[PDB]
Symmetry: D2
Subunit: 355 residues, 4 copies
């Protein structure tokens, strides 16, 4: 009966397409969450518009074009956002909790699980988590990039049944509907390639839908201004574009790796790229061609092919220095080379997420 | 003329020694701060009371004794807490920005300088930064542990002239005013020494760190009228820990905030070299290594007693160090097949004590 | 195109039938009003819940059962109420102005016209008036008594096109729903009469609702003044919009074919400044033939009052048959009571026409 | 031990001299009250600045110069004001109740006692009454006129020990201080007389309030709101601005309500009767009545004027207006024969009259 739904709210929806947060639009979406919340459902908000809110409350000032100017706006803005959410949800006697996070908080299993328990604990006590990127205290490197992908990670953390991306249009279209009249809303997508047939605004949404679906979470893109949208999505009623989740989803045991930020990279053979992508094999040091960055065993890493194309992320069995030394060698050689040995495999397939 | 002050406010100050946040108490401090802000000074708040505000708001709910329970109260509580600070400051037409951080945000130079640039940017546009530990989202390993230490780090990050630790008593006394019936208030201190660490424990660490980065730091009572304004004028108001004559190289102040990635046990001969003569650690003297860590990450250095003598940037990864531990420097390349100089931890990337 | 609607929200609507104000319920109704306000319609709120807001805010204290305990709760609770309204309307970018009144504010034409001009001026500047009884500062004598009757008087003062009474039930049935399964909601009413009051009373069981009795008095007042008035369930989705559109949502008490002269609509709002007991024949004249009261038929006079003031006309049984403007002072009515109109000047020395209360300064029933 | 105080704050004090309400200046004074409230004392607030608040909240709109404009601003503003007081007071965990009144609420003994009982009930339950003139709903004829005079009446209603009129200067000076740097402050004042009325014109309403309140036995003070700890110092009786001293033996409680009544009509009175009223404290006989103005009934409060046109007394009329004209100028034995009825010999008894 009861379900867990992550709702992502873009800046356009929160402002109604303006430079000022629109408390009428927001209160109406809050009402819908309370409606479900009271029915025994578990609601997780992922909010944007912090920087937007910062500009407004600071009266739209002139600030240099630097990382730090965005961060100061987020610091001021995130404060104003959370005040808004806590207040509007208090109309319905619902409490909220502020969680700000980045990829850095999902770099170990242990830190991912810490975030999970918190998020669960809130929901277990009828508190609606309000999630946002920690924009005020984060470098570019450790950031998720956007709240679309963040929401897919929050869905993974929350154990969501559905993920709802509310946005400035009805869903995913075949062509751009603004320029082409023959453009048509796509009702259902059965795997992200089934969608990049026809289908720049929509890029990070498809990435989010890919991640969530692979983790077994249905994901829907719809218009926030659509009346009763959040309820109807809970009931499985067609409402925008439904990205149907993967039938046999990727092992929970390694879904946390979606959220990690790579600690370094490894370039790899054609034969090794083939083995990973064609057969889901483990990476052996045989096929390693170069190793970049300084990283320890247990850290997550990127695996690139020789054209610089990112092919997988995974947990590295050896440190960066050692990889360089066993690179190109057979597994039996490892012990002779390093003086130690942690198995025949540089990255194991059970600690790898492909693509 | 214009000065930057960091003001740390602990839960006892904020609650007034009660259980609920005391908005009458807090607004009087906000007022004092606004007074300095309007005179051109640069105020930074370091707030506690997130978890306190969380239980209050939730109605003192029965929860399991677990880290998640402490983090859920903080999640709710920091929301309640930042809302208080924003509202009370708008009375005096002053804005706040919320900065939540842990040691993990000061593990690189890059990340430490990012926070610094954000903090200063706020101050440049007259916004009062309200800083706190990111309790809601943090494992124990990356937590600073306390806002006394956090405020010292905030001071370094903010290029503060003064750090003000407001507390529930007059300051740092000799023995104790309760126990020994004369035990006076220590007006001034010149370097925290072990005889001074014999006698608040966390407040001394924070003072020590602030003083070594060259920041005058004061422990005073939050309920002393006009305390904040006084401290800014340099008026004797409690206990003043004087800043170190020649402060620690700005070049390496970030290391104060990095969480150690692992630990090294070191010779009695190399313990001497590090502390006495300020020398770089050579593998020669390493006895044991702990944890997975890469080159570039900050680590702990322990004497054979198990005592923390230094924090520094490791030149070699953890596996390397175990292989070159207890060898001469020229042995390195033969042992590893690579080399990153003769030194395990350079004194230029090290902090003593 | 644009209309003026007065919405009356009783305590149970505001609380959702609890002892605590229910902001989810209220904000939902603000939303509906903001919608109308954005579309250029002029909305007036008549709010209850002031005393209830007070108990809630003060933690349900034990207080003596006195007039002053109700008034302290009303002071504390009205402060809270007007906050709530203000804050909620601000979500939709709408301003509210507070107006507290009693019948005393409507005892003159002058003070009635003052209350009117202020209400009109708020509306002309797109401010929503939030009207209540001044329960914190009032004796029982100058009070209206209930906000249903206050809302009728508001609708008059605003020049409202419709009056909407939101309540805790669908609103006025043809029979008791529990006693009769075919009992249906009464859709239309063309004038309130005795028979209807009896239906309304037999439809609620127990010590019949003095409380719906007041809603019918409000509806009579409004209807006579040419204002359609509707009783409906506050918790009905879309109700306020549907009422503005003319959609059948509860019970529609139709305005009077030819309404009572605007000229004297303010008399509804005045608190009588004394009474006059009247003949059998003068009762007939007043009620059956819309005649003026002559001193001839006055049997007894009560209280101290002046010419120009409004007073109650009682029939011999004790029933209040009319309210109207007294042409003479009370002391003068005693001296001319029982005498013909040519004797007035010989009796008093002065004169003010032949009539104790004129039919054009009188509201019957 | 535990006294009752009425702090009156004018628009100037609330706005710090500006056209916006200064919440920093106001929270400072709220705090000074809460300190006494916590100490067992009973605090009443009389607040101006409702129209000030309306103009600000409405974004300073151009409105026609009419009474409906002032009233609409007061409706909007009175809502804004009471939020403020409630919110700022809740910082100190103190509740407020809103009381809005006019002279019409003090025209009977009955309505006056009702007010008093409510104001006493609030205070008894530790609630700070925030009082203002009901500007949104009131014709000019029933308004008090200004919050200074209203605060005196609140002081009477609340049964206060001290009345504090916070304003934007040190207190009452020997002359206007903005026009004179040779004008000293006045520390103490023992009864207001016509000579002092001259020396006060805007400060004119503060003397009227002080007068009313002192005759009711309430010490009243004019001090500067900006002055630090001024509220606390006043409660201690520390000299802080100008202290108007309470009448040694104050006007009967039995008839203090007459101060707050709005005159229903007026009576022009003789030269001799003026003397009998003002010098010898007599009851007004019809003998001395010269002319009567307005319609009024018996039991209503009216104004008595001397042959110049000055207000010499306020009092409860025994006969109605149509009658008082008929019996004016005649002896008392003649009343029943003229009117046909009687109500004693006296037009206005001295036990339902307040002089001056
Ligand atoms: N961190 C951004 C979110 C924008 C997005 O990812 O869509 C903000 O709150 O402004
Ligand atoms: N299959 C090998 C590829 C290297 C090769 O083909 O030699 C690997 O897993 O690395
Ligand atoms: N970070 C803690 C305060 C820790 C301390 O008391 O120093 C909090 O927000 O409650
Ligand atoms: N005046 C009452 C409401 C009376 C009624 O609804 O009839 C109140 O505000 O509590
Ligand atoms: N029609 C008369 C009736 C008086 C009488 O019956 O004597 C009146 O209006 O008073
Ligand atoms: N009643 C006025 C104040 C008048 C005065 O200060 O005397 C107001 O609310 O603005
Ligand atoms: Cl699953
Ligand atoms: Cl819905
Ligand atoms: Cl595992
Ligand atoms: Cl605010
Ligand atoms: Cl320096
Ligand atoms: Cl100070
Ligand atoms: Cl009409
Ligand atoms: Cl609707
Ligand atoms: Cl005199
Ligand atoms: Cl007395
Ligand atoms: Cl003080
Ligand atoms: Mg790294
Ligand atoms: Mg690590
Ligand atoms: Mg029945």
């Amino acid at each position: 009966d009861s379900q867990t739904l992550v709702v992502k709210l873009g800046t356009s929806v929160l402002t109604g397409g303006s430079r000022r947060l629109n408390r009428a639009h927001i209160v109406e979406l809050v009402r819908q969450c309370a409606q479900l919340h009271a029915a025994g459902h578990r609601i997780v908000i992922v909010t944007s518009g912090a920087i937007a809110a910062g500009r407004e409350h600071l009266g739209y000032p002139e600030l240099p074009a630097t990382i730090a100017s965005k961060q100061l706006l987020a610091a001021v803005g995130q404060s104003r956002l959370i005040q808004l959410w806590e207040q509007l949800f208090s109309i319905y006697g619902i409490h909220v909790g502020q969680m700000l996070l980045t990829r850095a908080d999902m770099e170990d299993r242990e830190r991912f699980l810490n975030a999970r328990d918190t998020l669960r604990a809130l929901l277990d006590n009828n508190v609606v988590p309000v999630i946002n990127e920690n924009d005020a205290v984060a470098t570019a490197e450790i950031k998720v990039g956007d709240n679309d992908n963040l929401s897919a990670l929050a869905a993974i953390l929350a154990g969501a049944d559905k993920l709802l991306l509310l946005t400035d249009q009805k869903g995913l279209y075949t062509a751009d509907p603004r320029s082409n009249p023959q453009a048509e809303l796509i009702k259902d997508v059965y795997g992200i390639d089934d969608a990049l047939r026809a289908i720049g605004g929509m890029s990070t949404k498809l990435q989010a839908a890919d991640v969530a679906c692979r983790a077994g979470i249905d994901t829907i893109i719809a218009a926030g201004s659509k009346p009763g949208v959040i309820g109807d999505v809970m009931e499985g009623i067609s409402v925008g574009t439904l990205f149907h989740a993967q039938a046999t989803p990727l092992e929970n045991r390694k879904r946390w790796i979606f959220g990690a930020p790579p600690a370094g990279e490894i370039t790899v053979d054609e034969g090794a790229t083939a083995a990973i992508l064609e057969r889901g094999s483990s990476l052996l040091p045989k096929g390693i061609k170069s190793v970049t960055g300084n990283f320890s065993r247990g850290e997550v890493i990127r695996i690139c092919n020789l054209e610089g194309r990112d092919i997988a992320h995974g947990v590295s069995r050896y440190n960066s220095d050692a990889l360089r030394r066993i690179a190109g060698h057979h597994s039996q050689e490892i012990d002779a080379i390093l003086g130690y040995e942690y198995g025949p495999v540089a990255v194991h397939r059970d600690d790898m997420i492909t693509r």
